[PDB]
Write a protein that binds this ligand. Structure first.
Ligand SMILES: OC[C@H]1O[C@H](O[C@H]2[C@@H](O)[C@H](O)[C@@H](CO)O[C@@H]2O)[C@@H](O)[C@@H](O)[C@@H]1O
Ligand SMILES: OC[C@H]1O[C@H](O[C@@H]2C=CO[C@H](CO)[C@H]2O)[C@@H](O)[C@@H](O)[C@@H]1O
Length: 348
């Protein structure tokens, strides 16, 4: 078929499975969230957002309400939203919780994804004492456990992982895992993978980091333009040229906006207004114009940071007046994602 409705498997949408309900999880996990103290005096008592119907840890309000990430009926709905958005890859946050509830949820997500031909890759988070040895062990575990699942993502035969805050690990350690000669290499093994590191700051720092660490590519994550060098879209043409010259895969991250002031009240300078979709349009256009081979979307459902494309509805409670999609309908960001996926494919 040539309908212009099919999923794109070079489009990765960052997905968060950390939401809970009292009924399913025993707590409204993540809808309740600590308020961060301002990093710039002592004796702050910032408190917590309680995750009641009236007061959740987002400046927006989900169409699906305070949902559980373990609810198979929510997962079905999410996969139908990925189909509407044409986003073929779900990039799943992974915190190495080592608990049965995590294992269950990952299986449910893979199963629901496969029904709609969506693929799943892992976004490896900065879990406690993360290092290249336990990363290797965990890559082995994930490939062993999930590699034969029909929804497990591969690109030209290789799994792909995004590595958040990869700068927390020195290139000399990364080399041991990712150089073909590394002491604990995954290259040429059953556990080889495309490893996509986080490009943060200026080229003088990031170019040698990426080369010396032997990453296969890099992404930028942040939905807020200008937050880092890497999340400044006017740099993307030059970042892509460097990537192509050095055999690296650049996967710029685009998002519809940013606001996290319910959980970080002091972080207002990072707010990026959605402007009825114009912000998203501008950022997505820049990624496509850079001539990249793959794009990542921040985010499907990072509700705390206001980067979500998941449908949101107007809501005013006694405790908070939420933002909403304004003149646009709740599913606008899903259908606008599909529009941009089409433009990306036309360019590929
Ligand atoms: O603006 C807040 C910011 O917090 C988090 O990012 C932190 C860290 O993980 C990043 O590597 C650096 C990059 O300079 O910034 C912070 O210290 C994320 O939650 C991010 O989405 C958010 O914007
Ligand atoms: O937004 C609150 C959230 O912040 C941290 O998680 C990061 C936020 C966004 O994306 C990256 C990459 O997926 C996450 O690592 C962390 O402090 C969470 O506990 C917190 O809920």
């Amino acid at each position: 078929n040539n309908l212009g409705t099919e999923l794109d498997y070079d489009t990765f949408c960052f997905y968060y499975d950390w939401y809970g309900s009292e009924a399913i999880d025993g707590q409204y996990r993540h809808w309740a969230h600590a308020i961060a103290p301002d990093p710039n005096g002592s004796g702050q008592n910032p408190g917590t957002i309680p995750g009641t119907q009236e007061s959740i840890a987002s400046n927006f309000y989900p169409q699906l309400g305070r949902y559980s990430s373990s609810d198979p009926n929510i997962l079905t709905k999410h996969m139908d939203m990925f189909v509407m958005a044409r986003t073929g890859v779900l990039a799943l946050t992974w915190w190495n919780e080592q608990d049965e509830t995590e294992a269950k949820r990952i299986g449910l997500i893979l199963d629901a994804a496969d029904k709609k031909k969506i693929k799943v890759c892992f976004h490896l988070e900065p879990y406690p004492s993360r290092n290249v040895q336990n990363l290797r062990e965990n890559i082995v575990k994930l490939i062993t456990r999930y590699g034969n699942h029909p929804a497990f993502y591969r690109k030209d035969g290789k799994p792909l992982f995004f590595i958040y805050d990869s700068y927390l690990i020195e290139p000399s350690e990364w080399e041991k895992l990712l150089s073909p000669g590394g002491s604990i290499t995954i290259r040429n093994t059953a556990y080889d993978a495309l490893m996509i590191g986080l490009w943060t700051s200026s080229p003088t720092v990031q170019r040698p980091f990426i080369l010396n660490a032997h990453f296969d590519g890099f992404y930028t994550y942040f939905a807020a333009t200008g937050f880092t060098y890497g999340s400044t879209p006017t740099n993307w043409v030059s970042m892509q040229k460097w990537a192509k010259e050095n055999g690296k895969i650049f996967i710029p991250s685009v998002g519809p906006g940013y606001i996290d002031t319910r959980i970080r009240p002091w972080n207002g300078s990072v707010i990026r207004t959605r402007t009825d979709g114009q912000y998203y349009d501008a950022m997505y256009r820049k990624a496509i114009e850079a001539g990249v081979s793959a794009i990542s979307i921040t985010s499907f459902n990072e509700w705390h940071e206001g980067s979500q494309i998941e449908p949101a509805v107007p809501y005013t409670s006694s405790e908070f007046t939420y933002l909403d999609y304004e003149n646009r309908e709740p599913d606008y960001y899903l259908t606008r994602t599909a529009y941009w996926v089409g433009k990306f494919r036309e360019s590929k």
